[PDB]
Amino acid sequence: MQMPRRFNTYCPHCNEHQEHEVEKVRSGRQTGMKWIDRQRERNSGIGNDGKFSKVPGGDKPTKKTDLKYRCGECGKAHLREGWRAGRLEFQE
Amino acid sequence: ARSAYSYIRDAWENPGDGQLAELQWQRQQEWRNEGAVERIERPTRLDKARSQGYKAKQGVIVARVSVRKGSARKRRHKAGRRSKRQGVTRITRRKDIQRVAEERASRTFPNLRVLNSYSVGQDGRQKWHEVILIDPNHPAIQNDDDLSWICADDQADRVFRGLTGAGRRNRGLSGKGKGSEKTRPSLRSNGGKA
Amino acid sequence: GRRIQGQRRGRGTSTFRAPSHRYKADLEHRKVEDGDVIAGTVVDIEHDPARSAPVAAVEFEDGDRRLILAPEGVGVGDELQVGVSAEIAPGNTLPLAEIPEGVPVCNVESSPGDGGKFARASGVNAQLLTHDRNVAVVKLPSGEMKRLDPQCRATIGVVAGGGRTDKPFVKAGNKHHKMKARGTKWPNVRGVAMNAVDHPFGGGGRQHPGKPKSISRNAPPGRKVGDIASKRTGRGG
Amino acid sequence: TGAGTPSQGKKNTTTHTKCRRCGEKSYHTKKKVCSSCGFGKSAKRRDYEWQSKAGE
RNA sequence: GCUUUACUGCAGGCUGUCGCUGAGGACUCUCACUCCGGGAGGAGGACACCGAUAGCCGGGCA
RNA sequence: ACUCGUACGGUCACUGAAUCCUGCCCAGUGCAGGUAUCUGAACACCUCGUACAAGAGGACGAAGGACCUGUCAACGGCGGG
RNA sequence: AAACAUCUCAGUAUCGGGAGGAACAGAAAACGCAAUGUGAUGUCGUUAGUAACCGCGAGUGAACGCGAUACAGCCCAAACC
Ligand SMILES: [Cl-]
Ligand SMILES: [Cl-]
Ligand SMILES: [Cl-]
Ligand SMILES: [Cl-]
Ligand SMILES: [K+]
Ligand SMILES: [Mg+2]
Ligand SMILES: [Mg+2]
Ligand SMILES: [Mg+2]
Ligand SMILES: [Mg+2]
Ligand SMILES: [Mg+2]
Ligand SMILES: [Mg+2]
Ligand SMILES: [Mg+2]
Ligand SMILES: [Mg+2]
Ligand SMILES: [Mg+2]
Ligand SMILES: [Mg+2]
Ligand SMILES: [Mg+2]
Ligand SMILES: [Mg+2]
Ligand SMILES: [Mg+2]
Ligand SMILES: [Mg+2]
Ligand SMILES: [Mg+2]
Ligand SMILES: [Mg+2]
Ligand SMILES: [Mg+2]
Ligand SMILES: [Mg+2]
Ligand SMILES: [Mg+2]
Ligand code: NA
Ligand code: NA
Ligand code: NA
Ligand code: NA
Ligand code: NA
Ligand code: NA
Ligand code: NA
Ligand code: NA
Ligand code: NA
Ligand code: NA
Q1: Do B and A touch (≥3 CB pairs < 8 Å)?
Q2: Residue whose Cα is closest to the C1' of F73
Q3: Is the CB of residue C160 less than 8 Å from the CB of residue C121?
Q4: Which residue of chain B is at minimal alpha-carbon distance from A45?
């Protein structure tokens, strides 16, 4: 589906409607320093590694909308529930 | 002033440098041709030996023991085992090489008792340790106030029961506080969990 | 499964061992201080159970009596010589260097003084080709060019018993008798005629290898069977 | 040939015999080892914890 | 029990790296080390072996 | 162990005396060889990060793979129109 | 664990080596109710199924301290001779 790059709507921070800019959430890079990372290293050994021997699941036919809404004036973003969309394209 | 001994010690802080380096390069050639347990007239590291209880006296013996380097020499399982227990290559023994050396020496001298031991180097495939043993039955020692304790009946086969210094550190008894919950008073009384 | 036959072999049990206690001599060249003054006389020509070929007994000047890898054309009474100054005739042993090229040789040492390793079976022979102050090139019976230390001793002539491979065994019994004199399990059951548990080719409603026979060099024992690291198979091209 | 009765006829070989060390007829005269006390194999007397219930 | 391109691992093989290991991206040497030689000495030589680790193969096995 | 053995050897397999013979197929799988280029781990090396460290990235790149070739008395195949 | 691989059964069964009438431990490179505080070590009661671990599933699981029992502190190496 199509969607405006910018549009007026409620900013939960200013607590008042203002122009926002929609953008897809780019994945952040991991640091390999979280507790789970330490448990992986520490708990993996000889033979099967339990949960750490498992491998990546799969994919649902269509994914949900993963967007960031940025307030045009206070510059802060907020998140919203997403909706299944095979494809999402912005307008302008 | 500095004791002459401090020079032997000081040299062994870096067995790979200077004169000691060239000495080792030479000795190991002969050591590699000696047995598994060779009695020697004099400690290769006087300061260390004396520091551990050595004494130029009747009933005091020293022996260099050679032991292979590396992990456990283990046979792969011949029956059912869950993956966790199918290992062979990465398994290491819980007794350190120095302790293995101390035992081989004591067995060689059935009548003697291990007093202590220290390392004298290694090449690419074996480690050498010199073990100090004592004759608990020689009056020279029985009358020595600094050693006669090792004469007592309860010190018999002390090495095989981990009463050696190396045996006690290996048993995780160094710390008197945090971390030694399952080591002191013994590994066995704590259900073998250390 | 169970260990395959190839694996039972390595244990060296009776069935796989050679009847060593029934063998005659460990054929090796003599050790000479130097000079060449070592000559001996052929006293008898005996049969060598380990090689199915003849061997010659020789008494040396210094009283030493030993059996020797006998080349073709050597008889009782003949005088053999071993050393640098050895003459150049059949049966005499001397370092490759002292040997004239183009001359067939046998029982060649791989390392000087090892007593001989190459070209020792019935009727075979090595062929000294090149000389040098450094390397002596020899052509072994397999056809390979081998660079050898010219100081490596060898025997002049071709090994005795040539042509043994020319006559067929004709019957199982003959194979049997020969096989009994070797460290080998015989007869041979085809893998494909066994049960899966016993061999990688075992099993099936009919007999055929369950997979391709060409196996990798890296395959483990118990699995390395069939055509080992074959660079090719068949007769085509 | 049956592996039962007919094969019992060839059994006239002597193996286990009265042991010099423990007195049990367990000294294998071919192996020169007692299957009971370990004589011929061990200076120490043969014994195992599985010879009784674990907690006993 | 058996099979395999089932899941997960474990031996084994190949390969890089570190230790043993030294002198002057290709090279010489000799002193460790290995082997041949009764010995003298020869060959090989900082490689191979062995110890450690990494990638690939891996129903041979669990 | 083979081996008191050394390619006229002996290991691993297939077929199964003699006689007349044994066609076509290398795409897949297997094995083997080669390989500009691509891919390819760890150590050491470089950068960023951290008064250190974790960590991120770079350069280099072995076997192996991609890719090319050889091979069916190698696994096997020899159809519809 | 209602399968099962980590986990669990369990450092159990069993095996190898060895001591004593008891073993082992033991006079802090401790503790860390953080203190102007405690004061070798075992053990008992408790702390507590607490902290901690764990396909964060099933399960697993201490310590300091406290109340008790009993109490005991010393010898070398080296410096200088
Ligand atoms: Cl989206
Ligand atoms: Cl002892
Ligand atoms: Cl044959
Ligand atoms: Cl306190
Ligand atoms: K289990
Ligand atoms: Mg693992
Ligand atoms: Mg106790
Ligand atoms: Mg021989
Ligand atoms: Mg034939
Ligand atoms: Mg036979
Ligand atoms: Mg057959
Ligand atoms: Mg059948
Ligand atoms: Mg099979
Ligand atoms: Mg058939
Ligand atoms: Mg067939
Ligand atoms: Mg029966
Ligand atoms: Mg040798
Ligand atoms: Mg299976
Ligand atoms: Mg048939
Ligand atoms: Mg269950
Ligand atoms: Mg569950
Ligand atoms: Mg537990
Ligand atoms: Mg605490
Ligand atoms: Mg004093
Ligand atoms: Na851990
Ligand atoms: Na002893
Ligand atoms: Na532990
Ligand atoms: Na088959
Ligand atoms: Na093909
Ligand atoms: Na092909
Ligand atoms: Na169940
Ligand atoms: Na089940
Ligand atoms: Na777990
Ligand atoms: Na209190």
Answers
A1: yes
A2: C234
A3: no
A4: B84
Give the span between the Cα atoms of B23 and B45, in whole angstroms. 13
Structure token pair of residue B121: 């180097």
Q: Write out chain A residues lying below 8 Å of B87, CB-based.
A: 46-47
CATH number, domain at B144?
Answer: 3.40.1120.10
Give the burial class of A83: count Cβ atoms within 10 A of its Cβ; 0-12 exposed, 13-18 middle, 19 or more buried. exposed
Nearest CA in chain A to B82: A47
D20-43 burial by CB neighbour count: b if 16+ within 10 A, else e? eebeeebbbeeeebbbbbbbeeee
Distance from CA of B181 to the nearest CA of A (A): 21
Distance of C147 CA from E22 C1′ (whole Å): 30
Among residues C79, C64, C63, the alpha carbon closest in space to that of C29 is found at C64
Q: Would you say B31 and B102 are in contact if contact means Cβ atoms under 8 Å apart?
A: no
Nearest to B49 by CA among B119, B149, B122, B152: B119
Q: Measured CA to C1', what is the nucleotide nearest B175?
A: G30
Which chain B residues are closer than 8 Å to A46 by Cβ? 83-87, 90-91
The answer to whether A32 CB sits below 7 Å from nucleic acid chain F is: yes
Q: What CATH code is assigned to D1-56?
A: 2.20.25.30
CB C29 within 8 A of CB C107: yes
Q: Which domain holds residue B31?
A: 1-194
The Cα-based distances of C152 to A65, C60, C135 in angstroms read: 83, 21, 10
Structure tokens at B170: 């290996």
Task: Please report, rounded to whole angstroms, the spatial distance between the CA atom of protein residue B160 and the C1' atom of nucleotide F1.
Answer: 39
Q: Which residues pair with B127 in a beta bridge?
A: B67, B122
Going by the DSSP 8-state scheme, the letter that residue C213 receives in this structure is S
- Please identify which residue in the block is written with the tokens 């520490």: A42
- Residue C147: strand pairing partners: C137
Hey, is C92 helix, strand or coil? coil
Asked if A46's CB is within 8 angstroms of B86's CB, the reply is yes
Contact predicate B123/B16, CB 8 Å: no
Best CA proximity match to B71, nearest among B88, B57, B56: B88
Identify residue C191 by its one-letter amino acid code: G
Structural domains in chain C, CATH included, are 1-78 (2.40.50.140), 82-159 (2.30.30.30), 160-237 (4.10.950.10)
CB contact under 8 A, A46 and B90: yes
Interface A-B: count of C-beta contacts within 8 A: 16
CA of residue B158 to ligand 22 center, whole Å: 30
Biggest CA pair distance of chain C: 71
**Residues C83, C38: Cα–Cα separation, whole Å:** 7
- Closest nucleotide (C1' vs CA) to A31 is F55
Sign of the four-CA dihedral C50, C53, C59, C62: negative
Cα C190 to ligand 9 centroid, rounded to whole Å: 16
Name the residue in chain B with its Cα closest to that of A48: B83
What does the block give as tokens for C98? 């002292």
| Phi and psi based region of residue C83 (left: phi greater than 0; alpha: psi -120 to 50; beta: remaining) | left
* Residue A24 in marked binding region: no
Quote the CA–CA distance of D14 and D34 in Å, as a whole number.
14
